Design an enzyme around this catalytic site. Structure first.
Site, PDB file in Angstrom:
ATOM      1  N   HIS A  41      -5.204  -1.419 -10.793  1.00 48.15           N
ATOM      2  CA  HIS A  41      -3.872  -1.858 -11.050  1.00 48.15           C
ATOM      3  C   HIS A  41      -2.911  -2.134  -9.838  1.00 48.15           C
ATOM      4  O   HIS A  41      -1.807  -2.623 -10.051  1.00 48.15           O
ATOM      5  CB  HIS A  41      -3.205  -1.128 -12.205  1.00 48.15           C
ATOM      6  CG  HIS A  41      -2.662   0.232 -11.856  1.00 48.15           C
ATOM      7  ND1 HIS A  41      -3.213   1.403 -12.335  1.00 48.15           N
ATOM      8  CD2 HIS A  41      -1.594   0.602 -11.109  1.00 48.15           C
ATOM      9  CE1 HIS A  41      -2.505   2.435 -11.894  1.00 48.15           C
ATOM     10  NE2 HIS A  41      -1.544   1.995 -11.108  1.00 48.15           N
ATOM     11  N   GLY A 143       4.577   6.259  -7.279  1.00 48.28           N
ATOM     12  CA  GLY A 143       3.813   6.207  -6.052  1.00 48.28           C
ATOM     13  C   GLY A 143       2.596   7.063  -5.836  1.00 48.28           C
ATOM     14  O   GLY A 143       1.954   7.020  -4.790  1.00 48.28           O
ATOM     15  N   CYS A 145      -0.068   7.197  -7.681  1.00 48.00           N
ATOM     16  CA  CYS A 145      -1.335   6.648  -8.084  1.00 48.00           C
ATOM     17  C   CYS A 145      -2.354   6.602  -6.896  1.00 48.00           C
ATOM     18  O   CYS A 145      -1.993   6.227  -5.749  1.00 48.00           O
ATOM     19  CB  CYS A 145      -1.203   5.293  -8.701  1.00 48.00           C
ATOM     20  SG  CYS A 145      -0.394   5.308 -10.296  1.00 48.00           S
TER      21      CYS A 145
END
Ligand SMILES: *[C@@](O)(C(=O)NCc1ccccc1)[C@H](C[C@@H]1CCNC1=O)NC(=O)[C@H](Cc1ccccc1)NC(=O)/C=C/c1ccccc1
Ligand SMILES: *[C@@](O)(C(=O)NCc1ccccc1)[C@H](C[C@@H]1CCNC1=O)NC(=O)[C@H](Cc1ccccc1)NC(=O)/C=C/c1ccccc1
EC number: 3.4.19.12
Lengths: 306, 306
Positions: A41, A143, A145
């Site tokens: 993503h 942030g 991820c």
């Protein structure tokens, strides 16, 4: 003495964290040898998440569509491929800090350490169980991820989790380091929600053993139980049913303390039926389910305080 | 979302841990630049601890009385001195992994991360408050002496604790990195015991703020309190009295949430008087006191979930 929710030391993992940017999206990656792994993503905008076709989004990128920063150094991307819900970015430099490692898919009820990271910079470390519902109760902000979960055995890092998303109840979902989600979740906007969860019975029993090793017996009783009669109570209290394989796993703890498993089951049954009566166990007023039997053996003395 | 007892990432500290042996006693040391720090009791046997004269025990040692192992490498000792309850061993090699650092004496109620170590090898990391009674509720076994506590600000490590002993109640005592004990404890066998402890009121209030930032208001109420009326209740519940300086510290959390400090005090008063009525706050059924106001700001979003 003492008993704490303890994480593994995080340095071997810190030396692997980088930042990955594609377009206006920035998140963390994991740099081992000459590959950077990250959530796929990273190639999406907020609108793309409503209905992304990853194959169609990815074919429109080049290698230079990805910027990888390791500390202050830019690493050139020289290849890219999708693997399930991750990207594998090939880079021009092999990480000199690469530890001995492997990729593992952990199982429901097992614990791991999370290194929370933002912009490629590690911020904190904590220990998490994988819930029966395939979520984790983490602590993550925008942030985070691409932050990873791991266990350490000798000097080998077993990576088992990469962070992707937060669900509506505030708990967290992600993938193994092959990019396969834990649980039924998908990396796109839906009505997805954490399934009903259960208490991890095996861990509760392990933690009662810890309490006996560390010198406390208050909650024991003169009774015993069958596995099945124990499970009838477990279902009423939203505990996972106990199995023979669980009983076997508790062998070494049973031996160290001299309390048979099913006699420890009867003590749990009583705790479930009657409560703790204002008492604590290992400092807690509730039954703790985020320590596995292995966690207990790792942390506790190998000599019971008799 | 989420809220976890989070430690700082431990790699900068891992790269500093060594093993120190004198005679038959082995424990951990901290290697910065060309000095190794360690508990001065490394020079004692079990019998010596009953009534040690450290000056008399130390003068009988040479530099080669100490063996320092860093991973698999032996570091030669080329000088030694006592500083309060530590030794400072000079070594023939400066640690190339020495981070930016300083030594700090932390104050009662403040939190820090502990890197538990055995034989110079790190085993686990967890977060600890310094209790009002100058103890920590750690998790330590034989061999853990010389394990360190630390905070990280930017890339500067602030070392604040080195482990020395366990008290009869199972809690832990130690020194700053000048070798001055926290609390009234001494490095010799006595009848010493942890003083009565108190709940860290400032931390409780900070953690209620965290719960509001993360979206929960259930425990708020329409009342307000004076500082003094609040303290009369606090004393009855074995809470530290709140002061104006504490009130001021809670300013930034108060502003982020729009709840005045003393209105948050009245919500705590009600919680103390009435209990939580089977409800949880940030997942807990009890009031948590091991997160400082700074801990909350570090971990929580800077946008309240209104
Ligand atoms: C990650 O840090 C992240 O990917 N950020 C970049 C991003 C790229 C493309 C679109 C959106 C964001 C972030 C971590 C979250 C944020 C809050 N807490 C964390 O754990 N992940 C997200 O923002 C994801 C993106 C997503 C992944 C899979 C499927 C759909 C979306 N979304 C969520 O995590 C949504 C959280 C949420 C929480 C409360 C209310 C609404 C939405
Ligand atoms: C340290 O690992 C350590 O120093 N070990 C070496 C040592 C040298 C000389 C004499 C004895 C031991 C160890 C860490 C403890 C052990 C258990 N949990 C930990 O935190 N420290 C000790 O063993 C100290 C030595 C000591 C220091 C200061 C004053 C007196 C003795 N003792 C204790 O920690 C005693 C613990 C205890 C617990 C329950 C019942 C009796 C004694």
């Amino acid at each position: 003495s003492g008993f704490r929710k303890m994480a593994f030391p995080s340095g071997k993992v810190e030396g692997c964290m980088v930042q990955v940017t594609c377009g206006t999206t920035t998140l963390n990656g994991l740099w081992l040898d000459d590959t950077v792994y990250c959530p796929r993503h990273v190639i999406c905008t907020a609108e793309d998440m409503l209905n992304p076709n990853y194959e169609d989004l990815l074919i429109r990128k080049s290698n230079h569509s990805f910027l990888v920063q390791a500390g202050n150094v830019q690493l050139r991307v020289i290849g890219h491929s999708m693997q399930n819900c991750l990207l594998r970015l090939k880079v021009d430099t092999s990480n000199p800090k690469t530890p001995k490692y492997k990729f593992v898919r952990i199982q429901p009820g097992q614990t791991f350490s999370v290194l929370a990271c933002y912009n490629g910079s590690p911020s904190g470390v904590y220990q998490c169980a994988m819930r029966p519902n395939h979520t984790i109760k983490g602590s993550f902000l925008n942030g985070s991820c691409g932050s990873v979960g791991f266990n350490i055995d000798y000097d080998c890092v077993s990576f088992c989790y990469m962070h992707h998303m937060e669900l509506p109840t505030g708990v967290h979902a992600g993938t193994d380091l092959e990019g396969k989600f834990y649980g039924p979740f998908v990396d796109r906007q839906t009505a997805q929600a954490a399934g009903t969860d259960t208490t991890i019975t095996l861990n509760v029993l392990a933690w009662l053993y810890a309490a006996v090793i560390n010198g406390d017996r208050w909650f024991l009783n003169r009774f015993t139980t069958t596995l099945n009669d124990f499970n009838l109570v477990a279902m009423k209290y939203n505990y996972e049913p106990l199995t023979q394989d669980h009983v076997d796993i508790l062998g070494p703890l049973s031996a160290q303390t001299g309390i048979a498993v099913l006699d420890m089951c009867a003590a749990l049954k009583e705790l479930l039926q009657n409560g703790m009566n204002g008492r604590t166990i290992l400092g807690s007023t509730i039954l703790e389910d985020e320590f596995t039997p292995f966690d207990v053996v790792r942390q506790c003395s190998g000599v019971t305080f008799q």
